[PDB]
Amino acid sequence: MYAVFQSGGKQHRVSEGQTVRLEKLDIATGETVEFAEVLMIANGEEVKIGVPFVDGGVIKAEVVAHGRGEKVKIVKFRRRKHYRKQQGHRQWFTDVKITGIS
Amino acid sequence: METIAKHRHARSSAQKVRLVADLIRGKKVSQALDILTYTNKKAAVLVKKVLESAIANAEHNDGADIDDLKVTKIFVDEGPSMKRIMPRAKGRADRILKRTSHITVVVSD
């Protein structure tokens, strides 16, 4: 059932049905997306290869949320040299629910 | 019922009284009153009088029955310390601290 695909400059081993958090897409809050960058599909045997992507495989998904992650503090501190820095960060994500491993 | 009784500003440090107060903990009042009769310490007399009070405290006011009574919570807290000077050799002065304790006893069932 599971299939592999590239999204936010990185790949995801995903199954049909489950939710997946991935990097922000330029998409509305409840539209839909079609990943034609499918690298692999598994069931009985394996529809692998295709050079970068398979052939006629498309991973269809639905956009769940458009939130920001945990606050990651960044503390750069040079000991002894009268210097320190403070910087928060919240990475944007897009949660997507898979609805078709063709 | 819980029925608290406590010696506040008891002239003895926590450390010493807490040594006795570990003997009695989750023990039957009748058994606990005996121990402190034959515990050879000043703090035994100090803690006993609080418990022996706490039991009557409990029997008169609230709960009654001496048989079913256990010392549930007994604890000592460091009270105020009164400062005193003690002169040492070669002119220097040393601040002695006369320490006090807040002995609390809780006799529940």
Binding site: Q11, M40, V72, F77 | -
Partner: protein, 115 residues
């Protein structure tokens, strides 16, 4: 205008002492000691975001090298075999497939065998 500063300082100490919550001894209880630990925790936190990426790559590569040698191929020839077959699948997944679906994994090594 005299500015008494008992309110603002306590809040600043209290903020940091909350970040040091969990540490052993005075490092949790005592601002002057905690503030160092909270900074060093930040220095290590900044560092280990870089090391997380290194360690996991090693961790996957070990799993792939383990799973490949079961099938008879060493990691070096496997990845070259995949790169010569122009397979874009990363270590993260190869290691995940290697653990979970070995019946699947076998075919990737058999594909690497061809090249």
């Amino acid at each position: 205008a005299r500015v008494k500063r008992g309110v603002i300082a306590r809040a600043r100490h209290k903020k940091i002492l909350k970040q040091a919550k969990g540490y052993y001894g005075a490092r949790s209880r005592v601002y002057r000691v905690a503030f160092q630990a909270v900074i060093k925790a930040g220095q290590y936190a900044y560092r280990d975001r870089r090391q997380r990426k290194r360690q996991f790559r090693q961790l996957w590569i070990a799993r792939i090298n383990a799973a490949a040698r079961q099938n008879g191929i060493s990691y070096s020839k496997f990845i070259n075999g995949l790169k010569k077959a122009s397979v874009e699948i990363d270590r993260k997944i190869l290691a995940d497939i290697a653990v979970f679906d070995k019946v699947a994994f076998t075919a990737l090594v058999e594909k690497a065998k061809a090249a």
